[PDB]
Amino acid sequence: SPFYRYGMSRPGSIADKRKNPPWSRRRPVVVEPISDEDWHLFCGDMVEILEGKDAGKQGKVVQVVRQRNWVVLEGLNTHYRYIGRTKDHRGTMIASEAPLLHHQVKLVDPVDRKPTEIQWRFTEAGERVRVSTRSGRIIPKPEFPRADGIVPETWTDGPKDTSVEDALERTYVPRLKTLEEDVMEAMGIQETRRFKKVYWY
Amino acid sequence: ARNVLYPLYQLGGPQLRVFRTNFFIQLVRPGTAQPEDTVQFRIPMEMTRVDLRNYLEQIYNVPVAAVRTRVQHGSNRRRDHKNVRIKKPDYKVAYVQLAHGQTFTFPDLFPEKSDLRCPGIPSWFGL
Amino acid sequence: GLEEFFDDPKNWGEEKVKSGASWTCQQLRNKSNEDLHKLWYVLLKERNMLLTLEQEAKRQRLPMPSPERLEKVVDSMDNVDKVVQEREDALRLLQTGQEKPRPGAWRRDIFGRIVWHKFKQWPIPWYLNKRYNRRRFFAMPYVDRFIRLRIEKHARIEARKRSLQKKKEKILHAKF
Amino acid sequence: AFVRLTLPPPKVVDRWNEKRALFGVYDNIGILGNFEKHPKELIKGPVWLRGWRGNELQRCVRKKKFVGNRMFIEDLHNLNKRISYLYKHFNRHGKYR
Amino acid sequence: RARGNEYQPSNIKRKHKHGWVRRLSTPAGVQVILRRMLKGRKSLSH
Amino acid sequence: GADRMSKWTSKRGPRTFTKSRGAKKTGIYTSDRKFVQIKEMVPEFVVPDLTGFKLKPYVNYRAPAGIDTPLTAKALFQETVAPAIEKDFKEGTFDANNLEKYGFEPTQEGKLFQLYPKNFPR
RNA sequence: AACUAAUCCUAGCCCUAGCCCUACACAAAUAUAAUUAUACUAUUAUAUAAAUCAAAACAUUUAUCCUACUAAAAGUAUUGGAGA
RNA sequence: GAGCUACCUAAAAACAAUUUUAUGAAUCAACUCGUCUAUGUGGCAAAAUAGUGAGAAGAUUUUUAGGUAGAGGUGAAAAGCCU
RNA sequence: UCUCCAGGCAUACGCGUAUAACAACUCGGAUAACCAUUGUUAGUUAAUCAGACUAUAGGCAAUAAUCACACUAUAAAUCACCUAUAACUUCUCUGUUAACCCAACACCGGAAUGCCUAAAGGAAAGAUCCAAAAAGAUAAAAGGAACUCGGCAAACAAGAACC
Numbered sequence A: 001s002p003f004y005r006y007g008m009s010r011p012g013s014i015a016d017k018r019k020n021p022p023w024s025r026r027r028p029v030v031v032e033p034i035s036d037e038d039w040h041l042f043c044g045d046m047v048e049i050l051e052g053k054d055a056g057k058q059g060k061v062v063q064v065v066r067q068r069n070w071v072v073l074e075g076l077n078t079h080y081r082y083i084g085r086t087k088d089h090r091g092t093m094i095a096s097e098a099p100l101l102h103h104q105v106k107l108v109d110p111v112d113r114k115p116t117e118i119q120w121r122f123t124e125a126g127e128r129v130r131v132s133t134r135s136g137r138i139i140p141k142p143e144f145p146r147a148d149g150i151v152p153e154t155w156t157d158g159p160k161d162t163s164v165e166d167a168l169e170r171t172y173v174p175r176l177k178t179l180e181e182d183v184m185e186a187m188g189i190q191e192t193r194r195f196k197k198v199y200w201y
Numbered sequence B: 001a002r003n004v005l006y007p008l009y010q011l012g013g014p015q016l017r018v019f020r021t022n023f024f025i026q027l028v029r030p031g032t033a034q035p036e037d038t039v040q041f042r043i044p045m046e047m048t049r050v051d052l053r054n055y056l057e058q059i060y061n062v063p064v065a066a067v068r069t070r071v072q073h074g075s076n077r078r079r080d081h082k083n084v085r086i087k088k089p090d091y092k093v094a095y096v097q098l099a100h101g102q103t104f105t106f107p108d109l110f111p112e113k114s115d116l117r118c119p120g121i122p123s124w125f126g127l
Numbered sequence C: 001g002l003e004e005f006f007d008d009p010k011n012w013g014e015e016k017v018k019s020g021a022s023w024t025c026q027q028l029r030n031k032s033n034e035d036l037h038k039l040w041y042v043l044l045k046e047r048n049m050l051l052t053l054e055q056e057a058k059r060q061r062l063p064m065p066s067p068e069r070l071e072k073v074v075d076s077m078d079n080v081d082k083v084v085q086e087r088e089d090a091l092r093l094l095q096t097g098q099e100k101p102r103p104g105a106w107r108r109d110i111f112g113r114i115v116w117h118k119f120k121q122w123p124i125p126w127y128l129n130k131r132y133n134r135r136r137f138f139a140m141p142y143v144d145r146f147i148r149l150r151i152e153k154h155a156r157i158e159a160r161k162r163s164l165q166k167k168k169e170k171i172l173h174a175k176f
Numbered sequence D: 001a002f003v004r005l006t007l008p009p010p011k012v013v014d015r016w017n018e019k020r021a022l023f024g025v026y027d028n029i030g031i032l033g034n035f036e037k038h039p040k041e042l043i044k045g046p047v048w049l050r051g052w053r054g055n056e057l058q059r060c061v062r063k064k065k066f067v068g069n070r071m072f073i074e075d076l077h078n079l080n081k082r083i084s085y086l087y088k089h090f091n092r093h094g095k096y097r
Numbered sequence E: 001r002a003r004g005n006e007y008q009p010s011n012i013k014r015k016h017k018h019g020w021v022r023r024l025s026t027p028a029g030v031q032v033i034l035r036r037m038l039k040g041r042k043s044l045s046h
Numbered sequence F: 001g002a003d004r005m006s007k008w009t010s011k012r013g014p015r016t017f018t019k020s021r022g023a024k025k026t027g028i029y030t031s032d033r034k035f036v037q038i039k040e041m042v043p044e045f046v047v048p049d050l051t052g053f054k055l056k057p058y059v060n061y062r063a064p065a066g067i068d069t070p071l072t073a074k075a076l077f078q079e080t081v082a083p084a085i086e087k088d089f090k091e092g093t094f095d096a097n098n099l100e101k102y103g104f105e106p107t108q109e110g111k112l113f114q115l116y117p118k119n120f121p122r
Numbered sequence G: 001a002a003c004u005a006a007u008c009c010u011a012g013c014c015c016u017a018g019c020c021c022u023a024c025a026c027a028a029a030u031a032u033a034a035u036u037a038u039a040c041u042a043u044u045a046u047a048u049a050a051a052u053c054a055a056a057a058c059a060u061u062u063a064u065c066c067u068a069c070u071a072a073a074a075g076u077a078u079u080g081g082a083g084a
Numbered sequence H: 001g002a003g004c005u006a007c008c009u010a011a012a013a014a015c016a017a018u019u020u021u022a023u024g025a026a027u028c029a030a031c032u033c034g035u036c037u038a039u040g041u042g043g044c045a046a047a048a049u050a051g052u053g054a055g056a057a058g059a060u061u062u063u064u065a066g067g068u069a070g071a072g073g074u075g076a077a078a079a080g081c082c083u
Numbered sequence I: 001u002c003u004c005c006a007g008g009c010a011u012a013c014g015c016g017u018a019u020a021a022c023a024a025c026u027c028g029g030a031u032a033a034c035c036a037u038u039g040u041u042a043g044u045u046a047a048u049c050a051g052a053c054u055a056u057a058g059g060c061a062a063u064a065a066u067c068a069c070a071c072u073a074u075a076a077a078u079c080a081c082c083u084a085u086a087a088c089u090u091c092u093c094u095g096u097u098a099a100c101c102c103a104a105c106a107c108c109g110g111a112a113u114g115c116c117u118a119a120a121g122g123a124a125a126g127a128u129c130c131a132a133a134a135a136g137a138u139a140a141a142a143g144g145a146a147c148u149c150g151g152c153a154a155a156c157a158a159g160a161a162c163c
Ligand SMILES: [Mg+2]
Pocket: none
């Protein structure tokens, strides 16, 4: 829908259903377009806050909402709200982050922490690598835990999960036969009757 | 199989065989009270009672004695915020009676298993 | 037996059930036709059990445990279907060169539009079939006016769309 | 009557943008250019009213002559109906005879 | 007598008088369908 | 006062109006008003034996997925037919007339499973 | 000392310029009481547009409607109950 | 646009009891119609209700499907009827 | 449990979830209770009841119905059986709920057929008071059309004659 507004809460969640009802017709939010190639901030990076209440500090990127050009920093751009409030109990005060726009932060050079601008470039294999304009160096892609919470290395197969070796076994022998033809041959079914002529039109 | 063409049959033709099946069914708890042998199913609208017999006997190795079916009309009375009717889909219900005196009953899924005297003044103060 | 329509009795009542990843297309391609034929039914029985549990949860008004399991199975079955289709598609091209399994043609209907017509199977040739002959694949001259009106109506919609895009760019450039 | 309860956002106008700075240039193309081009040829607009002016009835008839054969059915039906209405007003009605 | 009840419903009559096959039977009826398609009607016929 | 927008089904109308819900026919009606089922018209499920099968619905998260390469007519031809022709051509025992030797089929008539027009379902 | 109310800016739209088009949208279903997997029973626009209206009525007649390059020759030659 | 109404075509249906006879006869229900009076008048109802009245084996009444269309159709002629 | 009222049950046509349980108490019922309202879950099972249901070519018909006998009458009146050809064992599909339809409405209206007439189905009064005027019913001394345009209406009458 044209009137959908992207927000902090995940799309499809209970809160998102409440904020975006089918009958909501609020004004659009104007967003500068950034090409998929040009985007250079990814979760797990370290950035520097150029301006704001928390200007000068550095933090880790924990979320990125591409639609709004948003980047969320852990423990920064913070306000206070009670969580778990009920009819009787107050709740427990916590610190809540607020999103920052992409132009409000800069990437930090890993070797010596300092703001640096970067340019995309191709390596020998051609795979794109971020390169710092000043003191040219490659900023490696950070590693981030999976959203679903699965850890592949620690994962242990259950009763209904195929083993890795079994999954990669190759049994296909290319041949000019349909799946139907092969199954009948293997299973031993024998049929000799043939369809009469049919007119297609 | 559904949403597919069947070869036209004429005198002396082969047997019709479907190697991969497109029909998916679900077992439901009876709303009313039914005999011990009977079981209920929800099946696609294109399935026949003959198909259900072969489906259970061959895929699931279950002996079947009889089958009956009905079509249930889905409601078209509720309206959306623009006052347009919402349609609940029509579906098909099947009743299957087991053979050889066998009995079945639906399993039990989801088995489970401040100080009144000083009012309004924060206790934090030690003075 | 009927016990296969339900999960392992131990799991009943549990809040979560661990599951792996769904089959990707590339992994399936390595497997043979006979293996895929068997793999279909293994997935099928898992699908029926998951559909059964989903309906029962609604009846009891409780959340379905680990609902993401259903989506994985449905994705896996779709990938199996296309992989088999890819093999058939290539084989048909080599032996016949046709790009579609079902015969058809391009024809004009009585309203003046051009539509693809899919053929049906018949026991007799077309010129002897009186029910088929009543169907008309031509347009008479009173339809020409409506053909022009459709073309012009489509032209208005396109002009408004391009005009709107240009105006939106003006706002963006001003803002940034 | 009801009035705004707040001031509208300010309007800022740049008086030295390219369009404003160079307005009028080449309006003397003929007299200073040996009369190879007439200033009317510098005008941009609809094909049927470049370097020409008329009343509404004249404008309607002139539009039909230039692009009448390239028009949509419904637009042409409305143009023809406007002409006949204007014809009867300008030739049969009014204070002065 | 009291008026206001002239509609005595009958499905066989309704489909024969205003139905799809009836509209296509004559060129005038075919043009009825074309007008409703150009307007964009969701219901072309009974 | 009739509803023009809802679907026309057999639950509606008088007794004499009936139509199907999309199930395929399995037999024929004769005169004398008797239904006669045909056995070959009833679909038969071909179910394989699943004893000793190693594959299961789900896969491990540690299994590497592969780069996607959809199969094409060129790829199938090279893997299956190209090697045999190459060897025969070197020996010189190749001619256009005997392409059937390598698996070519001139026409689909006579085959139980015809590739065009398709005469079998999924 | 406030209820009922009121304040708002962008969703889109309008007129031109430019340009022919090649958009003809998974599976399945539909001309049968459309959207019902197979035989019954054949299938096919239109002879000249009229009237309102102007002529202060009305009867011959009445620009556009009923399109063929702009500017001029020119509201000129011609036609008309020689009158609109 | 003939699902109301006017007339027609095809296939169907209903008519108790009593007296006469042997019937467009009689008394009077069902059913069809609508004489007279009061109430009602934004009414229960854009023509009704309460009583009282006419016919009731026939030119009777009723159901289902089909036909005739406005320069026209239909009419036991009221210039009636055709949503 | 008591007091009183007296068209009910099925089928056809039509309608299209109004059906049943739970939960809500906003909107709907012209008010409450309770739901006919809102949300969620459920439901109607057929080779016999009902619908649809494609072998071919020839040959041939004097004699109604009504208890059909008697009996007449007039309006003159519901495929079978034979001759040849061909086939040579079968059950799938669809309808099935309800306090319901046409009348702007939970409208004192209109609505076909079979069985039956209370064994089926129902409730005229929210509470109180006992004025005028208005509407409907019943009773009335003596007189009996003197009323009125007119015996209109009513009556313990419901009859006769003439133009
Ligand atoms: Mg109406």
